């Protein structure tokens, strides 16, 4: 049968790819960074405790100015915090209270949110009248929205639970490009610093690197063993890290096209919800289901510290653009800032 | 001097935002949100339609907001998603109750309903949420039992030795076979709830009273009991 021949060809191609990757791995990251001195005991403290949310916080996103941030809760609100003064700038009620994601535009002009309504709503913050109102209702996804990131004021990449990603032209409200190839619900999405590429981790234990312009999957990484919930690009853009239900963080390299290091501990058995690198990429903060966020040595895989204090499951994580602080939101409707 | 004015404006805006937030919380904490789950043939649509017709109210969610005895309610059915639910089911980890609907007259797909109930009950996040079990389509179950063409023991070998429980209500004009089948299905669903509940959450089975308002009353009573038990547990008295 033709299906058997196609499956055999796919297996042969996978074998060839694995053999090439094995031949390409002449050493390991641990075997090379063994001579560098470890980071000292990392101790962050809760500088601010942003409170005012009703239900569990599901996502957050820092601003480019590294002062304002936006968070989305499951009670149907979008609160924009002035992190320096703990004040609230905006609180946008949402048509659907089931919201899984939120984003901050690089210019700070708009915000985006989405969820079980399968719609990416975009709200204009700095309008003429000063009242935040929905500007575009991006529809076309047949699954829940899980992540959204602004390319610029007129473009946004959204990942959905219909196993497809998309690039939206906000002005026309239409899908410029569709990224298909995942066999499971896409859960995370991370833009490269150059914005020309992005990665997405789905519930099929695979992360695919996509091309924004051409709309094709350049590379696929299959080092995990469970659904991938988080993904974050390295500051260099040549690597990224992933979190998964199998209680492991894994660093993949784009040029080597294979996994470089794993960050797991015997006593850690809960899933990972959010990951984010430091400004220099030396630290890898990762939220967990055990209400704790662990700081990992991105070069030596030593757990440098722990950010304890959240009463419920940590769900979102984010490091400012200048690396000044890291903000963690969890399911007890509380946001915290650490440095 | 600009900084002082900017900070004063920020504080005033934050005060307005917090006032609106507390006004919204006063309503959010007084509203009960119920998540409707089931199968294609379970019959959630008729329940939603009856509850909307009895009390006037109300894409990817079949939202419905109504008011029953000056108590706010919110019934939503998650349609339009894919068959995989292990990720979006985590949103409803703070709902008041889960209204699980079963087709009692469909023996072929009864094990699928049992497996779905087991998965919902044993979920890590859905482990503190009580389930209101709705055993729909009782007239069809009675017709199937009385016909005799299809036997429950064909799909469930444990029905041969099953006996009607002592605490069974003898509805008027009820054949012993019909009530035996009803209570066998109810006990099959209750074993999963009692096997791992450990008092964190409860199950409230209810054979549908044909097409009557009694189902809405049962939902209201179950929600009231859940709220009472939640208050007792928060006070440390249960």
């Amino acid at each position: 049968s033709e299906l058997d021949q196609l499956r055999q060809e796919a297996e042969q191609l996978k074998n060839q790819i694995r053999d090439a990757r094995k031949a390409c791995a002449d050493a390991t990251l641990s075997q090379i960074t063994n001579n560098i001195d470890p980071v000292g005991r990392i101790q962050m403290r809760t500088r601010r405790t942003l409170r005012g949310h009703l239900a569990k916080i599901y996502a957050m996103h820092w601003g480019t100015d590294s002062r304002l941030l936006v968070s989305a809760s499951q009670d149907g609100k979008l609160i924009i915090w002035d992190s320096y003064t703990t004040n609230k700038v905006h609180a946008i009620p949402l048509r659907s209270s089931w919201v899984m994601t939120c984003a901050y535009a690089p210019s700070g002009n708009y915000v985006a949110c989405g969820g079980l309504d399968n719609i990416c709503s975009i709200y204009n913050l700095k309008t003429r009248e000063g009242n935040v109102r929905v500007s575009r209702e991006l529809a076309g996804h047949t699954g829940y929205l899980s992540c959204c990131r602004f390319l610029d004021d007129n473009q946004i990449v959204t990942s959905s639970g219909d196993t497809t990603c998309a690039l939206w032209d906000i002005e026309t409200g239409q899908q410029t490009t569709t990224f298909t190839g995942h066999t499971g619900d896409v859960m995370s999405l991370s833009l490269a610093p150059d914005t020309r590429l992005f990665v997405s981790g789905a519930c099929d234990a695979s992360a695919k690197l996509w091309d924004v312009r051409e709309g094709m999957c350049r590379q696929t990484f299959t080092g995990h063993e469970s659904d991938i919930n988080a993904i974050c690009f390295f500051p260099n853009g040549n690597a990224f890290a992933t979190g998964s239900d199998d209680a492991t963080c894994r660093l993949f390299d784009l040029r080597a096209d294979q996994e470089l290091m794993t960050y797991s501990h015997d006593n850690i058995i809960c899933g990972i919800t959010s990951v984010s690198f430091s400004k220099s990429g030396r630290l890898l903060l990762a939220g967990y289901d055990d209400f704790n966020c662990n700081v990992w040595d991105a070069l030596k895989a030593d757990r440098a510290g722990v950010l304890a204090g959240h009463d419920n499951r940590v769900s979102c994580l984010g490091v400012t653009d200048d690396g000044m602080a890291v903000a963690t939101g969890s399911w007890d409707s509380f946001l915290k800032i650490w440095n | 001097e600009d900084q002082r004015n900017e900070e004063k404006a920020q504080r005033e805006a934050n005060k307005k935002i917090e006032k609106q937030l507390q006004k919204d919380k006063q309503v959010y904490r007084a509203t009960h949100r119920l998540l409707l789950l089931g199968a294609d043939n379970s019959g959630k649509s008729t329940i939603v339609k009856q509850m909307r017709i009895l009390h006037g109210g109300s894409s990817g969610i079949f939202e419905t907001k109504f008011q029953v005895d000056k108590v706010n309610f919110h019934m939503f059915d998650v349609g339009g998603q894919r068959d995989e639910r292990r990720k979006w089911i985590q949103c409803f980890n703070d709902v008041t109750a889960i209204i699980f609907v079963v087709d009692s007259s469909d023996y072929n797909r009864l094990q699928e309903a049992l497996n779905d109930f087991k998965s919902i009950w044993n979920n890590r996040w859905l482990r503190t949420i009580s389930v209101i079990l709705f055993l729909n389509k009782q007239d069809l179950l009675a017709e199937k039992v009385l016909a005799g063409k299809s036997k429950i023991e064909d799909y469930f070998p444990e029905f041969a030795r099953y006996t009607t429980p002592e605490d069974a209500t003898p509805e008027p004009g009820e054949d012993p076979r019909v009530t035996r089948a009803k209570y066998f299905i109810r006990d099959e669903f209750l074993r999963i709830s009692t096997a791992s509940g450990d008092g964190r959450h409860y199950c409230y089975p209810h054979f549908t009273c044909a097409v009557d308002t009694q189902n809405v009353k049962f939902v209201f009573d179950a929600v009231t009991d859940i709220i009472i038990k939640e208050n007792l547990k928060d006070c440390g008295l249960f």
Partner: nanobody
Amino acid sequence: QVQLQESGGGLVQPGGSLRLSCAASGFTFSNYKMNWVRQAPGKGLEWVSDISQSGASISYTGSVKGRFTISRDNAKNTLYLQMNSLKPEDTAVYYCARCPAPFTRDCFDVTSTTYAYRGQGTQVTVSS
């Protein structure tokens, strides 16, 4: 990558016997609860059996209880399903499934039309 390969299916006369295997690779076997699923022609995917990580907890469907036996061996990373007293309606494609997350009692989306942690399946046919 997570990969499950099944074997053992084939022609079996009614009242015969069979044994299925599931060579699991790409993940630690002793951390996940395993499953067996089948798909009869013209019918949807139907759960058959499951087994705990250590093999202590085992459950089947009503139509296969007393005929099918599920077992696992964490040393060889394989899952077995011995099938006895086969009947013609058992003709189905049998898939070896895995729970999505480790250390988890409940199992979600095992019988979905598409599921990443599922094998290609082996056709089992029963006819005299």
